[PDB]
Amino acid sequence: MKKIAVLTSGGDSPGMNAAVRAVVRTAIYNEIEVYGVYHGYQGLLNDDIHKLELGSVGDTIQRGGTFLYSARCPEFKEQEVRKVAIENLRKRGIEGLVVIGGDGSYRGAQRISEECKEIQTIGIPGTIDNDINGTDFTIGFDTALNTIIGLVDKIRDTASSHARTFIIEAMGRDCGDLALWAGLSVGAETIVVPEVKTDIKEIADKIEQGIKRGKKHSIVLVAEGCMTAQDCQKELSQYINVDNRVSVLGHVQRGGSPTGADRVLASRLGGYAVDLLMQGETAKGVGIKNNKIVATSFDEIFDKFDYSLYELANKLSI
Amino acid sequence: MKKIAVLTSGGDSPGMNAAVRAVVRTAIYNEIEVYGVYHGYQGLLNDDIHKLELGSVGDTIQRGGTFLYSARCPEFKEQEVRKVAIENLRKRGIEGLVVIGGDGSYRGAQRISEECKEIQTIGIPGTIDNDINGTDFTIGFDTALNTIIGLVDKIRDTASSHARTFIIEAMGRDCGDLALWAGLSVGAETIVVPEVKTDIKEIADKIEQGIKRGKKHSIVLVAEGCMTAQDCQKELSQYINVDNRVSVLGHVQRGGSPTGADRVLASRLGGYAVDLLMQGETAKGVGIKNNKIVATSFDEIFDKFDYSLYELANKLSI
């Protein structure tokens, strides 16, 4: 192990740069040369690979996004396309590749490992979802969680006193953790997640039953996995009156400076990814499980939801 | 268990109100009456106890500080004084007391348990330190961590291009986690903590050795446990020239809206504290250990430092 590459792939998340920075510095510290792959797996084909120095990742820990870019490369689902990528790395003496992104990102990294016993592959969970196996938390969750708090607080502050219903869409893809954690945190009355059977009757039954009962605003956080915010405001008229702010947060959730939580988390897993390459390991996803940094096979990673915390969230809304 | 009291005690931390809110709501949910003790243990003597309704803790999750106040009550170190406190609770039918604060706060709660087998006591770690046993993290750490990031980012942005040294004092009392976590996160070159022998020669040896080597600013984070920021700027002239921003962050670190991390954490432990009272337990501190919510005896609580992460922090500064 003397030449490592690194890419970022899929929807961007806060701390991606922190993660890269950690890989670069750790590797270089261990007298390993490091190559920045630009535009995700697209760049891996386009041969958009470039050596990185210590200074190449100066003034990035705090950076939102990814400075190596990310692409969508659906064509990478094809052995024959992948053969080109593999060569681009194979021609430059790169024996290891690190990959920062979703469980999607991980896929192609597993492919490369299977399809080339030379190139070691390692996966780092740079994503907002929280939806990766073998990690309690992913890089971007905490930041996203705080973005939503922040956005929610704004809507409150910029709204008039009439609208007493904020139907807020959180970006979980198929995992309700963000919505749960953000719901709890903003004192949402109702939280709508894939993992719990959503009783819209009961939900309006509780807005009606506490807002002609004299509070200031009620908020409904919604996991995008469950439904759109427009779908829920439709679904909620069909019992009671609410036609008030339906906020579709979206991609702002992916921007912004990572929080402390993600900077450290990213840094730790970027370092650990490099160690594992030095220790000759391959095709694993790193993460944090039971406050221990760990590695988990892409096998196990492809082959959960705190209903207690959900139940608690509800216990805490009057 | 039908009457519970709750207080906040010691230096205030973000999420204290969240914690209270959780106790109140959970208790009431379980048809337990709940009494707000005002001004810490002082109020416990002064008999400044007052029933709390669901609405008494509306619009508090996000609140910085504590709305029941906190006092310093050194006199509480005296059996005879405590006898009064105990009676105040004992006269109103309160069989359980919940206490949100430092390991100091916990002390007197253990006393009360020993000194009155009627009153169940439970401790919740509302503090910035991280310095309580049987919890990986305390309520306020994450917020503090992010405050420091934020403060550090400001100083940067409001400084001129000359001063290339920011000697920043972080509030850990005797524990270097904040300084470590904040140092890492702001890309500090040097981190000064109680737990590592601090080689001031080597430190300036590295500012001198990278700043006439052409970077923009270097930052030194300092655990207040180790030394003052003024002491370190003195200690650092005594080899090399630096007479640049020595920022003494202080009590701002204790203000501000808890982050998501602490709102959830607080909420979870406030709920769990109430459960444990219902389950007839006593004289335990709750916390989160290995991503499991747990309880730990005040015994064990009175009878650690990731040098690997410290070592990593350094690996990542050029």
Curated annotation (Swiss-Prot), chains A, B:
Pfam families: PFK (PF00365). Homotetramer. Homodimer, inactive form. Component of a possible RNA degradosome complex composed of cshA, eno, pfkA, pnp, rnjA, rnjB, rnpA and rny. Interacts specifically with RNA helicase CshA. Belongs to the phosphofructokinase type A (PFKA) family. ATP-dependent PFK group I subfamily. Prokaryotic clade 'B1' sub-subfamily. ADP binds at residues 21-25, 156, 187-189, 213, 215-217. Its main location: cytoplasm. The active site is at residue 129. GO terms for biological process: canonical glycolysis; fructose 1,6-bisphosphate metabolic process; fructose 6-phosphate metabolic process. It comes from Staphylococcus aureus (strain NCTC 8325 / PS 47). ATP binds at residues 11, 72-73, 102-105. This is ATP-dependent 6-phosphofructokinase. One of its GO terms (cellular component) is 6-phosphofructokinase complex. Substrate binds at residues 127-129, 164, 171-173, 224, 245, 251-254. The lineage of its organism: Bacteria, Bacillati, Bacillota, Bacilli, Bacillales. GO terms for molecular function: 6-phosphofructokinase activity; ATP binding; fructose-6-phosphate binding; metal ion binding.
